[PDB]
Amino acid sequence: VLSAADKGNVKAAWGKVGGHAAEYGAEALERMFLSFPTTKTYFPHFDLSHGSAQVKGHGAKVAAALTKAVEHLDDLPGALSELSDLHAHKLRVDPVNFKLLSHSLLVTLASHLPSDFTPAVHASLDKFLANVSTVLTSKYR
Amino acid sequence: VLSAADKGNVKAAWGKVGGHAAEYGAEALERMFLSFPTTKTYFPHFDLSHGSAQVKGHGAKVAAALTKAVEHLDDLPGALSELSDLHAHKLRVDPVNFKLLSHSLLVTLASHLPSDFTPAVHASLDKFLANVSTVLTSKYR
Amino acid sequence: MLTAEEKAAVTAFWGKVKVDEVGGEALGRLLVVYPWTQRFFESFGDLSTADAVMNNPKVKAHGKKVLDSFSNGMKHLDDLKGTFAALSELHCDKLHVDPENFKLLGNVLVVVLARNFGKEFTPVLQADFQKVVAGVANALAHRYH
Amino acid sequence: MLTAEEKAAVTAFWGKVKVDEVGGEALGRLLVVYPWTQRFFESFGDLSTADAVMNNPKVKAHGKKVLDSFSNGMKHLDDLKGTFAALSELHCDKLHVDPENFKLLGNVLVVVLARNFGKEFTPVLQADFQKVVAGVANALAHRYH
Ligand code: HEM
Ligand code: HEM
Ligand code: HEM
Ligand code: HEM
Numbered sequence: 370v371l372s373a374a375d376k377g378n379v380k381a382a383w384g385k386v387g388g389h390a391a392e393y394g395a396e397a398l399e400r401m402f403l404s405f406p407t408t409k410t411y412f413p414h415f416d417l418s419h420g421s422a423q424v425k426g427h428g429a430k431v432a433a434a435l436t437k438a439v440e441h442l443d444d445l446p447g448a449l450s451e452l453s454d455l456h457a458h459k460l461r462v463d464p465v466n467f468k469l470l471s472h473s474l475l476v477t478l479a480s481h482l483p484s485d486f487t488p489a490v491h492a493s494l495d496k497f498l499a500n501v502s503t504v505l506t507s508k509y510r
Numbered sequence: 511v512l513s514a515a516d517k518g519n520v521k522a523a524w525g526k527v528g529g530h531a532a533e534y535g536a537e538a539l540e541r542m543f544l545s546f547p548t549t550k551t552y553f554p555h556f557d558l559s560h561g562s563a564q565v566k567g568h569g570a571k572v573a574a575a576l577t578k579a580v581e582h583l584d585d586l587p588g589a590l591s592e593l594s595d596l597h598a599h600k601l602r603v604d605p606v607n608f609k610l611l612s613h614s615l616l617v618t619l620a621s622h623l624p625s626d627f628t629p630a631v632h633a634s635l636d637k638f639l640a641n642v643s644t645v646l647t648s649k650y651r
Numbered sequence: 652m653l654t655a656e657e658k659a660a661v662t663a664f665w666g667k668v669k670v671d672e673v674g675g676e677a678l679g680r681l682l683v684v685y686p687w688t689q690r691f692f693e694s695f696g697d698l699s700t701a702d703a704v705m706n707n708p709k710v711k712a713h714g715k716k717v718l719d720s721f722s723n724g725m726k727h728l729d730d731l732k733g734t735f736a737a738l739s740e741l742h743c744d745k746l747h748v749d750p751e752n753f754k755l756l757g758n759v760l761v762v763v764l765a766r767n768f769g770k771e772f773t774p775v776l777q778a779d780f781q782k783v784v785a786g787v788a789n790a791l792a793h794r795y796h
Numbered sequence: 797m798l799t800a801e802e803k804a805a806v807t808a809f810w811g812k813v814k815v816d817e818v819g820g821e822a823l824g825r826l827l828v829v830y831p832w833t834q835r836f837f838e839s840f841g842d843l844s845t846a847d848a849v850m851n852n853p854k855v856k857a858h859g860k861k862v863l864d865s866f867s868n869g870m871k872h873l874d875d876l877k878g879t880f881a882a883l884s885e886l887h888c889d890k891l892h893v894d895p896e897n898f899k900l901l902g903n904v905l906v907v908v909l910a911r912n913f914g915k916e917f918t919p920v921l922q923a924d925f926q927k928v929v930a931g932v933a934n935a936l937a938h939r940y941h
Contacts, residue, residue, distance in 0.1 A: 479908075
C-alpha cells in the first residue's frame, strides 16, 4: 500500500509535471513503443509514427487517468473501476505490459524532472505505478 | 481483491485440505527446495533433506499462516502484519521466491486434491496465493 | 540439459502421459487461470466461461499439438534450441507472445502432471520436469534474444 | 542485436557523456527502489535510509565497478555471452541473485541515464540502450540455462 509519505511524493511530483501531463503521457507511449515493440500489437488501428495525432490523443487520455489516480490515492480500486474492466476484460492486456509502460513513464519523468526525481520520489512513483497496474489487472470474469 | 466466487473456492478447497495442511506445507517447501535450489539459501542452517524435522516443523508454521489467511480474506494485510515485516524487512525475501513457493503449493494441492482442483478452483487458489505474496512483500520500504 | 540419468527418469515417466488429455487440460487451464492469454486465441470460438474453455474442441485439439511438441522436446533434451526453432519464430516474430507466458504454460503443465499422476509425480521427478519446462520456455524465447 | 546504426549511436553517446557518478547512482537507486536487493550488500554498512544508501561510500565505489563492467560490455556488443560468462556464474551460483534483478538494474541504469542526460537521451537512443541492457541481463542470466 502507498504510505502517507509515498502519497506526498506522488502528489508533489505530479504537481511538478504540472501543465506537461499530456505531453509526458504521449512521450511515455512513444518510448514504450520504440523500446518494447511487442506493445505495438495492442494498437494495430493507430498510426504509431512519431508525433501521430492518435498517439498524442492517447497520451492525453492515459495522462488524465494518472491525474485522476493522483487525486484519489486513498482509493485506487474505486477510482480506476471502469479502466480495470476495460484493460482486463475487453482488451486482455498482458500484465507484463503494465511494467513496460510504467518503466517508460519513469524514464519520461526522470528526463524532464531531473532535480525533482530523487531516489525517494523515484521509489514512491514506482510504487504508485505498480499499484495502478495492480488495480488495472485485478479484475477478470 | 478476491471476488465472492474466489473466496468461496478458497474456503471450500482449504476445507478439503483439513487436517492435512501441515503435511502439504512441508511437501510444498520440499518441492520448492528441490525444484528451485536457490530458495535453500534463505535457510542456511536448516537441514533440508527429505524427512528433516525442520522442514516438517516449518511446513506446519507456513500452513498455519495460510489457514489464518483463509479465515481473514477481507483483511489479509492486517492478519499477516507480523509476517510481512519478517519476510520483507527482516529477511528481505526476493519477491520471485513467493512465486516459486506458490507454484509449489499449487503442485502439492493438485497432487492431493485432484477431484477438488478444478480449473476454477486452481484460478481462485492462484489469486489467493498471489494476494498472500503481495502482502508478505509489502514492507520492504 | 539434464544428466543422462535424469533424462532416463523423465523418459520412463513421460511414457505414461496420455498424449491427448493432458495437453488440452494444460492449455485450457492456461486460458482460465491467466485470462489475458485468451487474446491469442480469438478464432477458437467460445472462451467465455471455464466450462466453455475446457470443453472447447479447438482448445482440446490445440492442446494436443502443444503436448506433442513437448513430447518432441523430450526426445531432444540436449538441443532444445534447434528443436524449438520454427516455433520460436512463430511465437515471437509472428504472434508476439510475451515469453513470460512460456514459463506460465510450462508451470501449468507441471500442475497438470501433478493432478493426473499424484503420488507418482514425486518431488524429485517434478524437479526434473521443472528443468525441462524451463528449457522449453528458454528455447521458445530465443528469437527475442 | 543492435543494427550497425544502433551500435554507432550507442557508442557515440557513451563516448561523450561524463559517467563517473552514474554507476553509484544506479546501484544506490536499485537498493532504495527494490529494498530486497539490500540482502546482497550487508557488508556495505548503513543502508537503513534512502539517504544512507545513496551516500554510502561502499555503494558508490561498487556502482562504479558495475558501470565499468557495463562499459566493458559496450566494447564487445558482439559477444555479451562470452564477456559475462564468468560474472554469470559468480552472480547466479555464488551470490544467489535471481536473474529478474539483472533486468531491474539495467532499467534503473536507463532511468539514471535519462535523469542525467536530458534531451539528447531521445526515445530512439533510449530504445538502443534498452537493447544493450537486455543483452547484458540475458548474458548474466545464461548460467541459469
Ligand atoms: C498506467 C497504466 C495505464 C493507464 C492509466 C491506461 C489508461 C488508459 C485510458 C485512460 C484509456 C482510454 C479509455 C477510454 O476510452 O475510456 C486506455 C485505453 C487503452 N489502453 Fe490503456 N492504460 C494503461 C496501460 C496500458 C497498457 C500497458 C497497454 C498495452 C500495452 C494499454 C493498452 C490500451 C489500449 C489498446 C486501449 C484502447 C485504445 C484505443 O482504442 O484508443 N494500456 N488506457
Ligand atoms: C505463502 C507464502 C509464505 C508464508 C505463508 C510464510 C510463512 C512463514 C511463517 C509463518 C514463518 C515463521 C514466522 C516466525 O518464525 O515467527 C516463516 C518464516 C520464514 N520464512 Fe516464510 N512464508 C512464505 C514465503 C516464504 C518464502 C517464499 C521464503 C523464501 C524462499 C520464506 C522464507 C522464510 C524464512 C527464511 C523464515 C525464517 C525461518 C527461520 O530461520 O526460522 N518464506 N514464514
Ligand atoms: C511454452 C510452450 C509452448 C509450446 C510447446 C507451444 C506449441 C505450439 C505449437 C506446436 C503450435 C502449432 C504451430 C504450427 O503448427 O506451425 C502452436 C501455435 C500457437 N501457440 Fe503455442 N506453444 C507454447 C506456448 C504458447 C503460449 C504460452 C501461448 C499464448 C499465451 C501460445 C499461443 C499460440 C497460438 C495463438 C498459436 C496459433 C494458434 C492458431 O491460431 O492456430 N503458445 N504452439
Ligand atoms: C547490469 C548488471 C550487473 C552487472 C554488469 C554487475 C557487475 C558486477 C561486477 C563487475 C562485480 C564485481 C565488482 C568488483 O570487482 O568488486 C559485481 C559484484 C556483485 N554484484 Fe553485480 N552486477 C550486475 C547486477 C547485479 C544485481 C542485480 C545484483 C543484486 C541485486 C548484484 C549483486 C552483486 C553482489 C552481491 C556483488 C559482490 C559485491 C561484494 O564484493 O561484496 N549484481 N557485479
